[PDB]
Amino acid sequence: TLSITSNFDAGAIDVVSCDSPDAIRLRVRGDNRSEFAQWFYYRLTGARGERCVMTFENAAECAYPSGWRNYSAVASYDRVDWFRVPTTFDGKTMTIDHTPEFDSIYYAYFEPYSEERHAAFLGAVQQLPQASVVELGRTVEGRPMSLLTLGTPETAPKKKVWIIARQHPGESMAEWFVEGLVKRLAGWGDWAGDPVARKLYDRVTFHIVPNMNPDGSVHGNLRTNAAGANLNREWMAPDAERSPEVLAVRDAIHAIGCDMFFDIHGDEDLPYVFVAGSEMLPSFTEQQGKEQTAFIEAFKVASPDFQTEHGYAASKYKEDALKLASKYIGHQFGCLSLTLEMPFKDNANLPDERVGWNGERSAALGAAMLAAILVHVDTF
Ligand SMILES: [Zn+2]
């Protein structure tokens, strides 16, 4: 007897039919208070050594159907080690065809990043002499909005570098990226002995929000918070009831100041790591151009995964572009301001059939970007 369950952190699925392994019928559940549908995460038990054919009947009705083109789902026996599994898409339905090796398995859209993991990581990070953690406010559902500051005393004002992640809760790659970056700043693991963090603290103070959408995350949402708001459309006029997550963070950025800004996302459609810059802003000066180009050049050197060939086609500027964090910040502060995008699929330039794009590659990217930040501040 097969059983599909989803009542856990970030769980999401609607089961249509589940009584023959070769005829499992499913629907992407969708965001809790929004029409956007794309994230899925479920547990399947009772299928050891049985070929499971799991068809997502509403695949074409999802937020980004091209997200299913050349895409493989991820799976795990224990929530620790994740791997890609055989998946096909015909523009109408999506099907995972996989034979579980053990009694209990999970399938998901991307390697998850749980609330527990967040709490364990921040609970350890706060113990570093250079760390502090401040609760800026509460989410819709009373979860903390936590700001991690990493820095040493100013004896000359240090540059304020802001990194926010996971405004879109299903983009768990964003929190993995922050974890890799923070681990390097901590001098943990293989980062012990590395001089980049030390040099950085002489020039820069970091202000980091690892999870911009705690509620959306646990809800199994892709794009919205628990009230149905797209947080990355709330930056020009956030609300205490609808978008307290942005209200609290935007207030802190204004109070604290900002010299460099990075908004960390994942992209459904494109199999590339890329940035969206501020060049479309009418406020984009020659010096800003010089600075953005030079950071991008440094990031290309720091990380072979990062590239500029592929990305969003930069359409004409419209006033509502300021609803997006990196544009709002770019316009308001006149500083280096970027959206960074990681793929749900793989990096097509450097594919990995076993894992595609994942937690470890996202984290390596975050650690690499630190080295580009250092190069950058040492130049400007
Ligand atoms: Zn996003």
Author numbering: 2 to 156, 159 to 383
What do the authors say?
Carboxypeptidases (CPs) hydrolyse peptide bonds in target proteins to release C-terminal amino acids. One of the largest groups, carrying a single catalytic Zn2+ in the active site, is the M14 family. The C-terminal domain, which carries the Zn2+-containing active site, serves to classify this protein as a member of the M14D subfamily of carboxypeptidases. Although eukaryotic CCPs possess deglutamylase activity and are implicated in processing modified tubulin, the function and substrates of the bacterial family members remain unknown.
A potential cytosolic metallocarboxypeptidase from Burk­holderia cenocepacia has been crystallized and a synchrotron-radiation microfocus beamline allowed the acquisition of diffraction data to 1.9 Å resolution. BcCCP consists of 384 amino acids and forms a tetramer. BcCCP forms a tetramer arranged as a dimer of dimers. Residues Met1–Glu112 form the N-terminal domain, while the remaining 272 residues make up the CP domain. The N-terminal domain folds into a nine-stranded antiparallel β-sandwich. Here, the catalytic Zn2+ is coordinated by two histidines (His171 and His268), Glu174 in a chelating η2 interaction and a water molecule to give a pentacoordinated distorted tetrahedral geometry. The active-site cleft is occupied by an acetate derived from the crystallization conditions. This anion, which marks the binding site for the substrate carboxylate, is held in place by electrostatic interactions with Arg226, Asn235 and Arg236. The BcCCP structure displays an open configuration and the BmCCP structure a closed configuration with Tyr320 directed into the active site. Nearby, two differences, Gly253 and Asp256 in CP-A but Leu327 and Lys330 in BcCCP, make the the S1′ subsite much more shallow in the bacterial enzyme and replace an acidic residue with a basic one.
